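As promised in the previous annual report, we have extended the structural survey to additional targets. Below is the entry for glycerol-3-phosphate acyltransferase.
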Amino acid sequence: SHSRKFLDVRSEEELLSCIKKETEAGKLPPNVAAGMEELYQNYRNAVIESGNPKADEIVLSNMTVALDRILLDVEDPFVFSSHHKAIREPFDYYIFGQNYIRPLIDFGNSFVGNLSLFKDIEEKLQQGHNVVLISNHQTEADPAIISLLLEKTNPYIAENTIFVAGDRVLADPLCKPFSIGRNLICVYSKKHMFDIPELTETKRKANTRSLKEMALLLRGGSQLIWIAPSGGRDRPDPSTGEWYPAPFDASSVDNMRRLIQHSDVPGHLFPLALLCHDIMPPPSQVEIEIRVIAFNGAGLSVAPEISFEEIAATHKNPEEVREAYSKALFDSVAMQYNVLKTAISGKQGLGASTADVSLSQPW
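The corresponding structure token record, generated without further manual editing, is:
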């Protein structure tokens, strides 16, 4: 039976004592207990540093509920398979991840690129078409960056986007409550497929099942799916420290395009850029060389779909077409990303807008 002791915590001393007690009962592995203490301190620090006047209340509330939900999953892990629908009841995991990430976003220094295209995307969905957002990936909070930035203007996208998500993030005890509250297509990454030879067959069968269910969803129409063809989160250049979208896997863009073609329903792929690594960056040696959670502006942009036909008509074979189409999507993502960068880290705000990227603050 679930220990609800984290919900009785009213102080940092009780928090640490609770962590100790759950570990001593064997209900929390020592490395997970340690990760929980680091998480607490880092979340606390970022919220206090934002200047938020309700910092102490937000931290106590979000962190005691986060620890309770992390322990709940450790006691009996939620099993993810193929398509996962966000859990909204009795405990709304979606709204929990939204409220958990809210205080880390500096909305005054956050921007949306080409807001009107998100309305275009909703129209296409209303026509029964499917839309795939071909994006870069920066943090495990990416779904909340998208949902929070668009919650006022595009609540439909905020609540119904489906994220193609890899096994590494879905297995992490600290991220599980967040993941449970999102719509997902769960896949085993190519990167880790061969790490454990005794699991490869199983992962491949599950990947086929996930693809099959995604194809079935597409046949039904009106699906909005996000996928980062790079797989992983962007990393800073190991020498310069510069962050920008990681290389795409051109086969991943091709596989999505072809599933759309066989679904017999009109489908659209739009290049999407996300800028939020400062809020919850992946670990990196150059960052040590030159904080796991921070308050910072976030950016989100979308640009028109790339003409696949124009590329197929001007390239000599299948491989060259695949590479050029993936590169054209990637080139758009990187272009939008630099405009977001100039607006936020460059401090130009709306003055970073260009002919192709029009910024706004829809909140």
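Residues 43 and 124 are 39 Å apart (CA to CA). The radius of gyration is 21 Å. These points will be discussed at the next consortium meeting with the crystallography subgroup.
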